[PDB]
Design a protein around this ligand. Structure first.
Ligand code: MG
Length: 271
């Protein structure tokens, strides 16, 4: 019964408090994004900087939402698509130096913002080998778990990055709790039946489904949310739906539909 909500990357004023929270789900906010780049789009070799709207989504805001709702945790997502318009290319000076900077800088950030975990959301690999990427991230997650710094690690794959993320998951599944597979990568014409099929295929690549969350976008891309919710009811009826995530609170905030699908998703998971 996991529900997750990405939030903070658009700097559009959305707050944790705008998002419907059902007391009956395991609720995760995911701050988007921490990036190991400078604002001039220079890589920092794993020293993570803040690229969510942290003047609004402050440490006090994280502490407050968690104090009010005992079922809420807050994680941070790494990478994303762009940094000041440039692609966030995963890049490391060396594996060991990137890992040392990533573990330390994210530990500092997690302690500062009262966070519970990290989500891996790199998508550009034109400047790094897959082995290098997998080693960096696998070590990062393994160390944060061993150091008792995080309770939840996730990855956010889609088909275009299958080579990287299946290698990562197949190797580090014991320390990766959740697979935030991006089903909003598929077409807007996707039917509920097709979605169930697409979910089965993705689940087959990421351990069978126990850890693989369904998802949709509220930003006007991918399968229609109402259609995805229908597919999710079928997966739930089968006893094979671990949870749902939405990209994103910012999208919902700016949308005409507002947050009705966040609510519907959580109601589905708890009913
Ligand atoms: Mg994207």
């Amino acid at each position: 019964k996991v529900f997750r909500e990405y939030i903070g990357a658009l700097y559009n004023g959305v707050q944790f408090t705008d998002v419907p929270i059902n007391s009956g789900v395991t609720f995760h906010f995911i701050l988007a994004f921490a990036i190991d780049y400078t604002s001039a789009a220079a890589a920092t070799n794993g020293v993570f900087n803040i690229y969510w709207q942290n003047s609004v989504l402050t440490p006090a805001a994280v502490q407050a939402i968690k104090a009010q709702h005992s079922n809420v945790k807050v994680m941070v997502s790494l990478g994303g698509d762009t940094i000041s318009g440039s692609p966030v290319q995963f890049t490391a000076t060396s594996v060991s130096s990137w890992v040392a900077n990533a573990v330390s800088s994210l530990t500092s950030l997690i302690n500062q913002y009262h966070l519970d975990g990290i989500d891996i959301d790199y998508e550009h690999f034109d400047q790094v080998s897959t082995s290098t990427f997998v080693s960096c991230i696998g070590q990062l997650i393994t160390q944060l778990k061993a150091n008792n710094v995080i309770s939840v690690a996730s990855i956010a794959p889609f088909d275009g990055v299958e080579s990287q993320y299946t290698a990562l998951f197949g190797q580090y599944s014991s320390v990766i709790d959740l697979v935030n597979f991006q089903f909003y990568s598929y077409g807007a014409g996707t039917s509920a039946s097709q979605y169930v099929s697409l979910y089965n295929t993705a689940a087959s690549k990421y351990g069978g489904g126990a850890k693989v969350l369904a998802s949709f976008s509220t930003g006007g891309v991918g399968p229609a949310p109402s259609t995805v919710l229908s597919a999710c009811q079928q997966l739930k009826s089968s006893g094979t739906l671990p949870g749902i995530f939405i990209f994103s609170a910012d999208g919902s905030y700016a949308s005409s539909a507002k947050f009705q699908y966040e609510q519907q998703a959580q109601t589905l998971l708890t009913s």
